[model samples]
Target chain A: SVANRYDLMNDVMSLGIHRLWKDHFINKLDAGKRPNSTTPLNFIDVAGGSGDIAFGLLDHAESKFGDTESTMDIVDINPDMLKEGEKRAMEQGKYFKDPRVRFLVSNGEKLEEIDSDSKDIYTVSFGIRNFTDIQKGLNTAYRVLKPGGIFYCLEFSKIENPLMDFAYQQWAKVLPVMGSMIANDYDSYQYLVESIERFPDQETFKSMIEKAGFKSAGYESLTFGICAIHWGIKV
Target chain B: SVANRYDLMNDVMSLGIHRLWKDHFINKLDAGKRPNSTTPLNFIDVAGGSGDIAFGLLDHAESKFGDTESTMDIVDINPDMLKEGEKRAMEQGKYFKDPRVRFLVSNGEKLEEIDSDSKDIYTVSFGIRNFTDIQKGLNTAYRVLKPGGIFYCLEFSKIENPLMDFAYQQWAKVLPVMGSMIANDYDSYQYLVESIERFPDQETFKSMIEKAGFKSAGYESLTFGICAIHWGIKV
Candidate 1:
């Protein structure tokens, strides 16, 4: 029911900086095929396509590289989220009826419909933190991607500067209050903050990527480790 | 040489909690071999044989597990640091000149004389952070360990609680000031604090270990993420 409000909540929580972060994230991936490449890229996005990054990546590819031959599967376990993305795409009159993009409902850990060694690039944005087992999910990611395919992710992480984190933590609590005021859903919002605490720090996640049979797993912190981008290549 | 004052400096920096942290670290590793197992475990400590954790591990193995068959090689890049540990062992009448324990000079990134796939267990404590390239050192760890071998590391990490970090950060500056008072070495001491900031958080490090071909890289923050223990298996 609240699927439409999802992006709004992110904006409220991040004070609209999530837009810049998402833009910067897609920008960093350089997510388009070269003109000389023989085969079109298979892009698999873990989070739903209704949300921006999946579509944003496609936009970047079409705009920068003029590459529309590439195919993208926007997989999200939540059907509501899948619908949300489809609806959003229709509103923009973009990729709503396009054959190049498909909205699939599937869990990232299983990706039951995704064939192994089929994808050219795998991207998971802010979804692994919600997984029952991140390591198990990563195994699925590695199993589905073709050899030499890349894994890219962007998510919350520990803040580096002590002063900044101190200020951020106090503001972090505002989410629950906002939840109560906006939707009377304080419990889940509080869970969101707690989950962030339970999530692994940047280095530990890098190790997880490495453990998943990805070569040269590396991460870069954005905004002093408040958020991070992790990347690895399957060998 | 400031080598002799190393333990004292740690004491000053950590308010003597370093000993507790070191003791808890070795205790948590459960570093010992089964009596029924055919071969004695090969214990490789990268840092120095002289450090308390290396010796403490041996002590735990002998006292708790009664596994004196296991062997330990304490390797350190710095000769002075190696000498410090050797001297400490002599003063305590412990592993000094013992055949089972060897103090070898070597770099963690290469381990020039160590054989690949030879070690049963690889341990690095509070050392990899000081490396010129932490990823390179991790690759060496993967190269040296046998299949199913374990990699264990202990190091500082970002604090979980923002308020606690605020207090810790204020106290953190005392180290450089203490360095100035104790040895007039403020620059290096200040660099120490800066490096901690530059170090990857727990998740990022875990990903690095996984990227190094270690299976199931995982980490647990000790004392609310001020310090952490990371583990992985080569499988």
Candidate 2:
């Protein structure tokens, strides 16, 4: 466990831009338990051990859709990360043991306790690239989501503008330096940058999601492709 | 005829950002005559009478591909705009009276003189939204390009970021004001804004291009969707 500072490192590394990305991601999801709907949304945020996305999802639904009925499963493979999420949920005083939210330590490749075809929405942000098998993780996502369920992911992606790409790559050369200065963990930051480089690009990832049997796969790049929001539907 | 200062207003309205967009548009086209290729490219720039895009394309092809063999036809509905292009070419002293370039007065929807399947590339920048019939113009583009030829367009598009959209729209409110101040013509700028508003969005326009029988259609937005570059290939 890297303790509570992994997200703080994220804040410093992205210069607070990750927050804007998450804000847009939640707004784009636009999911809620509507008045005419009989079922509360069964939401899962895999690798959402930090609780930022899980908490943001609930906040968005409550504020925008008046959706008080939806529940969230906050799962991560690391128990230490789950503990951090639990601590924050308690500090926030909303989802802490509120019965609507659960902090579960679970591998994203297979949510061991979660039933198949039960979730209404599934999300993984900045996590799947670290997965042991990304395709298996996607397959599991498709397995847990009910028909019409949405799968949302946000991850670093390739840039488009050649000039911007030149600057961005030069900027990226300094990222791990920024990472180590901010977190004092040069080795892990090295791992993070390589991980980002190894992840499939916008078009390739879209096809991977479709290959997982999710339909209508697509993506929209943000900030000239520093990152992208990729999505699909469980058909 | 709006006279030559119309481009000056473009510089003012976009605050010179239009130049970067065009720079990127030219680089994305990335086309030129290659070595060992028996035929020089036959290219047309529709509504390119003002000639920034037409000239930029030739410059890019020359600098990036070392291509001097390709020819350009700069077509426009108005002869005055064609005159502006000619004046610029003469001032520049590169393509002025050059055998490889032709200034042709023609409507985009029916390029009455261009032969079918005669062009290897076609481009329209900041012009199609004003087309009396945009689909007919696209069909005309498809008709003139040879098999595997590319169709490229750059136009104002819907912004995706909500905060950016609000600011963009608020900024748009004052565009005609700037136009009247810059050109002393509010009516035409009013027409320009409405023209942009009436144009189909990225996805809808992609489908429209596909509907025109161009294959593998797609688009990538620039500057947070202030505008986009759309392209297709004639198959």
Candidate 3:
């Protein structure tokens, strides 16, 4: 229900800085590489539209893990995102054409299509929590992930700072006004900004992951805890 | 920088739930014990004041580990907190006659009073990040703990959800107002809320603990990430 207007509103609301934050999230994953080894790491980006976060991961992964062997799957419920991602991948050309990236249309929360115990990493950026049944989404992710596979979720978290909270709320209220001028859709932008406050905080979500069978769950907050990337291993 | 009003604000902000939370923290440790065993459990409550957390621990520990065999320490920099704690310990009449519970007035950030390689479980509740230098505080904690000893911290962390973020911010803003009304110290309450934002996120703080020589560090967020309880062990 949210992803259709999600990326556009994210750009409008975060002043195009969401991309930097997502990139930062990917860079921290050891760029999908094993330390002191050239073995490529693999990732499954569920509901990752048009491969933005996937591409970000791959670009950084290639740089840090070398330009060979690493792979990523960009699964999206919206075909539009995949089409755009395909075009972007083609235009980038050459080095980007390592035959290591795949784009597919699929319901991220219902990933029966994914073979069991195959993926090394499972990722969902602002999508898992959007599922009509979040626990089902998490369970699906858990089912497909091999033991020890890490799950990464990049999403909005509750702001804990008073001054920053006020600034954020005020900024969110004015965001739709800016969106009307930039994206020409005030309601969509409004919804996007409003959705931020609706997201779960780091602690409850961590417990949820633990309940879903992740053994060592943890989270990292970015930009003064406005956005957090939660992760855990299926140990 | 924000510790001036730490205590008053903490009480008001938690709606006296601070006591309950501390109670729960100590209870969790007690549950980990093996029943009917004479094994000594050394608990060091860093910066524990008035022996609230210490008493909580001792209350449970005395039954489980026996007052004579178990060892507990209440380390604090403030003499008033220690004095109040001593009074409470006497009134409680449980660990009062037992020499196992000792109150030491020392800057917990520097464990000049604690012997090295002795502590089995070291804990700091809402006080670890308040030190002038956080790393120094962590180093002192690590220096005094024995290998395989559990190190736990209960403190405030960034909320990850957007809506909860707003609520938390409102809490932060209104806490001082409430504090002024009840505790008669609005500024201190304001400082308490502000301190949550200033502290490092769960992961960064975990890294810092690991850097201070802890192994297997992790955190669990509570109440929608408003607060976090972190645990680690020395390998």
Candidate 4:
């Protein structure tokens, strides 16, 4: 039921910063190298519901780098979200019907359909914390990525400033109320906030990524540590 | 020159959060366990000019942990700063004259005066970046620490948000002017700002610490990434 308003809610809650974050995330993948490389890039976007990141990756690759040969696989645990992504693709004039684009329904912790050592880049933007077992999901990400492959993640993290953290916490309290008013769903939004709170802090999450066998795991705090970008490479 | 106004300028610029960061840094050294251990703790504060961190460690160990058996060695490259710390200690009625506290003038990169594997914990607060060779300083810290000992560092880091970073940059530009007005030393204050900017981000620094043979290196950004605390344990 919430799938219809998912993207809209995201825009409303984050005030469109999520779009910028996704854009920056895609831009950092060194996609510009694809045009000169011998092989097409293989990208996997885990929990890529609504097709936002996938579409952004393709747009950046083609428009910014003039790369059209790169392939992408979008996987999500929810079929409804996948269907919504397809609907959006159709609305955009079937651009996603290209053979290089794919949509699959698979659990993040067990990406059985995504073959091991197949992906050159793996990304989970604002999605990894929802996994029931984050370690398993990280291990699965490591398993699917090829040697020398890169993994990037974006998620909510702790706000370190005392004054700013107080303000942010107050602002967050209003979110579920807004969600109940706009979407008529209170528990879903509450769950969202709780999940963010339950997620590990930046350093702990980096350690977890390392424990999953990702080399050089580290993170960068963004926006006063309210959100962060975690990255690592498979060796 | 700037050493006389060092603590005052820090209070003015960072709004006193530096004190909180130093307290938290000492508290994280597992100081409370000293009372239960058979051996006394040997703490080393490298480049510990003005003796803020060294004093904090002693106060915390005695008042909070009720462990007065811990010994601290304060090492710094600047004799003037070390002399200032001793003067402050004398002014405070010789609280630091206990045989347990020792001050030595030594280069952070070499620490030739400190024996290898002598310290249970190594700390360098807002000091390592000043070392001519940061890697050598980290290696020295690792060498001076016993097996299973811990290393902690506190320093300024990167702000990842574009809008916030822009605002922070604007604010940082005014710090040198304020320093010039208060301390009457423009170049030294300017050097402080430039040195902070030249330091590596948290993740890269954690990697450097790991490269120095300390295991499980990680960091936590404080005050919107204006400052960060990095830690690792000797394996």
> lDDT tens string, model 2, A1-235?
4544565445433434576788999999998887677678989999879698999999988898789989999999899888888887776677887899998888889898899999999999988988889889999999999999999998888877675576555445554543343234567667877888898989999998999999999999987786899999999
- Provide the lowest-lDDT 10-residue window in model 3 chain A: A175-184
Worst 10-residue lDDT window, candidate 2 chain B = B175-184
lDDT of each residue in B63-174, candidate 2, tens digit only = 8778898999999998999998888788667799899999998989999899999999999998998899999999999999999999999998988878657655544565
TM-score of chain A of each: 0.95, 0.94, 0.88, 0.93
**Which candidate number has the best lDDT?**
2
Model 1, A1-235: lDDT tens per residue? 4564555445444433556677898999997887877578999999644668888888999899888888999998899888888888886788898899999988789998999999988988877788889998898999999998999998888988777676567555654653453245578667778877788999999999999999989888876777789999988
Interface RMSD of each: 19.2, 18.4, 17.9, 18.2
Residue B109 lDDT (model 4)? 89
lDDT of 3 by residue, B110-215 (tens): 8898888899889898887577788888888888889888889998887787865765565566545433532345666566666777899888999999999999
Candidate 4 backbone clash number: 0
lDDT of 4: 0.77
Off by over 4 Å in 3: A1-7, A35-39, A94-98, A177-184, B1-235
> lDDT per residue, candidate 1, B1-235, as tens digits?
4463555445444434456678888888887876666578888999744567788888999898888878998998888888888888887778888999888899778997999999988998877888999999999999989998999998888888775576566555554643453244678668778877889999999999999999988998876687789999998
lDDT value for model 1: 0.79
Lowest lDDT block of 10, candidate 4 chain A: A8-17
lDDT by residue for model 3 (A1-235), tens? 2343455455434434466678778878755675577666667898876677787777776676564567787888888877777776776663245568777788888876778788888888877656777777887878888898988899888776776676676666654543453234567656767667677788988988888888889998876567789988887
lDDT of model number 3: 0.72
